[PDB]
């Protein structure tokens, strides 16, 4: 009956909790002790990108660490040359309500999506001189919150309809759907080997999915509010989540439980974006209090802040070679920091 | 100027892109953005279909003023996540059906939505144009049955005018802060043409207020 199945689920959850607690020999901070801290590291803004005329919700670096795509509420997807602050491209979007944008690892495509519940793929390299929309992936019943290219023909998109999807761009059809995630999933992060991906939702939980199998592998909890940002450790065996709870957490895939928590009592604003540095030594989080915080990932303290924005920092990203970090904000300015 | 011939032509392209961005972002500041809200089957379609998938965007014009109204009632997801995208609209057109006072209660759901959205931190200053439509069916129902059959606190007379005034007063009693924003209440029906004029007048008031805020006088 329903009560019997509920009792079985409760017993399974208790067994899972006991198994997770059994293997927690020592805390992460215990091992990362008597180790040289990063120290107060100040990073200055080298470039300021001054084209957007509305709030910026998403930016993505190119794989060459030079091109940079950014989306704004003015219905603009601008591709910048970060070295010279030159605007390489400006794409007018059909729907100005865009909450995500992605850059193809090959560099030939960009993707965007938002409150239209569509994922638009635009081709950057055509025989004509204009950027053309290549595909319109539809099938999500909620707003699109994230999207990431697997290759030139595969893209995984998370929606507010509580499910993720993997698409075939050449046919515009969902090859697989990742369901079973109560509440809107607000972020996703592809593994460096592009074999798995994690997604954090409004149930205050993160889920690890196998792209090939199409089923959830592990579920991680510990937040008491909806998760807005998630990112993968460079190794690929861990990830970090930021939530409206005004805290960040580090989970380990193999240990299958929380490793440590990055928080401070002076911070009462949620995390909009999170990202790692090369070697995964610095966790770069964006907050609603108009500033970004650089935490030492191995420890739990603050390696620094950069601030520099007059409104909420919505998006941030780190280059593939770790040269700089770009931060966008609701004040309509992108800043490259080094 | 320490630039190659190809770099100089790249800067010229960027300058042309900037010029086109300014031109596109200057005609957007001359348009009026309205956020359309309301419960299901609450006459929202009637007021959005006066003249001329997630967000449904409707663009119309009235006396040299361009209005963009974004109906977002088909999202069916967590409103707290995508509601800050509309921080900056001129007004919130909130549609409520008067006849849905006894159909768990539809009117109670409408008041819950109004309380949730009016006192939102993102819409603390934006004005609300409250349309109370299907007033003909409300009159017919009141003639058939008084409001007191479902409502208990209604100690007034079972008259159509008194019941409508009671509903309106209860609805504008739901905003905690009456100094930051002004609620415009209008009684409409299926056959009406004053809705566009009323929203235009409310937008004119908020435009004057925005100009005063720009001066710093307000």
């Amino acid at each position, epitope marked *: 009956e329903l009560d019997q199945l509920r009792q079985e689920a409760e017993q399974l959850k208790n067994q899972i909790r006991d198994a997770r607690k059994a293997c927690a020999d020592a805390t992460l901070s215990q091992i990362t002790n008597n180790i040289d801290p990063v120290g107060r590291i100040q990073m200055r803004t080298r470039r300021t990108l001054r084209g957007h005329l509305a709030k910026i919700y998403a930016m993505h670096w190119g794989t060459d660490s030079r091109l940079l795509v950014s989306a704004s509420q003015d219905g603009k997807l601008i591709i910048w040359d970060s070295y010279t602050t030159n605007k390489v491209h400006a794409i007018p979007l059909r729907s100005s309500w865009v909450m995500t944008c992605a850059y193809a690892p090959s560099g030939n495509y960009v993707a965007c999506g938002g409150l239209d519940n569509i994922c638009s793929i635009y081709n950057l390299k055509t025989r004509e*001189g204009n950027v053309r929309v290549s595909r319109e992936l539809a099938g999500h019943t909620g707003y699109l919150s994230c999207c990431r290219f697997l290759d030139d023909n595969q893209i995984v998109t998370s929606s507010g309809d509580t499910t993720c999807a993997l698409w075939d761009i050449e046919t515009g059809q969902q090859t697989t759907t990742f369901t079973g995630h109560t509440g809107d999933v607000m972020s996703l992060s592809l593994a460096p080997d592009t074999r798995l991906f994690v997604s954090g939702a409004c149930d205050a939980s993160a889920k690890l999915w196998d792209v090939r199998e199409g089923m959830c592998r592990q579920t991680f909890t510990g937040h008491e509010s909806d998760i807005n940002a998630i990112c993968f450790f460079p190794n690929g065996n861990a990830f970090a989540t930021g939530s409206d709870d005004a805290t960040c957490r580090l989970f380990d895939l193999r240990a299958d439980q929380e490793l440590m928590t990055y928080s401070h009592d002076n911070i009462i604003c949620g995390i909009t974006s999170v990202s790692f540095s090369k070697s995964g030594r610095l966790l770069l989080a964006g907050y609603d209090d108009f500033n970004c915080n650089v935490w030492d990932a191995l420890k739990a303290d603050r390696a620094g802040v950069l601030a520099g924005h007059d409104n909420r920092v919505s998006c941030l990203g780190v280059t593939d070679d770790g040269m700089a970090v770009a931060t966008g904000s609701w004040d309509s300015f992108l800043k490259i920091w080094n | 100027c320490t630039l*190659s011939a190809e770099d100089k*032509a790249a800067v*010229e392209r960027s300058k042309m892109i900037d010029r086109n961005l300014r031109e596109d972002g200057e005609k957007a500041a001359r348009e009026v953005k309205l956020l359309l809200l309301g419960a299901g089957e609450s006459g929202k379609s009637t007021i959005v279909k006066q003249m001329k998938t997630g967000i449904v965007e409707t663009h119309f014009t009235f006396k040299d003023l361009h209005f963009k109204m974004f109906d977002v009632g088909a999202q069916r997801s967590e409103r707290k996540k995508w509601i800050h995208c509309f921080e900056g609209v001129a007004a919130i057109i909130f549609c409520v059906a008067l006849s849905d006072y006894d159909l768990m209660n539809r009117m109670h759901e409408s008041m819950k939505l109004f309380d949730s959205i009016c006192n939102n931190k993102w819409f603390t200053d934006t004005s609300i144009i409250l349309f109370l439509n299907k007033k003909d069916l409300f009159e017919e129902k009141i003639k058939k049955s008084p409001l007191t059959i479902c409502y208990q606190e209604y100690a007034g007379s079972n008259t159509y005018e008194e019941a409508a005034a009671y509903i309106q007063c209860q609805f504008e009693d739901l905003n905690k802060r009456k100094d930051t924003k002004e609620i415009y209440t209008h009684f409409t029906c299926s056959t009406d043409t004053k809705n566009v004029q009323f929203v235009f007048d409310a937008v004119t008031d908020v435009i004057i207020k925005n100009n005063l805020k720009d001066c710093g006088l307000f």
Partner: single-chain antibody
Amino acid sequence: VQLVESGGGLVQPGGSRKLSCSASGFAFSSFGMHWVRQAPEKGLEWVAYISSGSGTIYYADTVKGRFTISRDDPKNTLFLQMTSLRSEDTAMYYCVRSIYYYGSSPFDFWGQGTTLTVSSSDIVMTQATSSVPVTPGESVSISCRSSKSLLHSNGNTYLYWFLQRPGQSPQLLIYRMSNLASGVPDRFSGSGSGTAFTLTISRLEAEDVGVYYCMQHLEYPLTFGAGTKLEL
């Protein structure tokens, strides 16, 4: 993508004629446009350039003053008006589209060209080879030299390679030092450093036979090199 050049014909000395190019199949207003010249027996020679949006305009020294270049973006047409046509202006004129942003390929498409017959500081590109015979299937390497270094402070070496088949307009092969173009076979490879550059074909077919030109884009005027002919 197509560029059809119209005009030309027989012109008396000291006369004037108007050359047009009707571009179609691409976003004309976003492309800078060049007029390039080729004498009946000599190589290619750059003539004029107009940027995107009719901004900067450049002319060759040998035609400065008596030539003018304009464009009509709404009509998608490029005009070259010439006055006081001397006897040295009898040649075939090609129209070349060229877009300039990071990672673009300038001079990617060349027009068919039109013939104009009239009755009777700069960087030097030199190619010391011509009429080189080679059997198909082998590997052939040709070389080009420059007056000064084409490498710039930003790291780009602005050297372009063009192949002109017999009876056809030249087509881009390598749009910078070691930067293969789009749609060309992978056997072509550009290389070089500083002032000496090389283009190599690993296994030449019977189709890649013609005249090979090296052009510089470091600064104006854009100077070509004398052709290096390949014979089967």
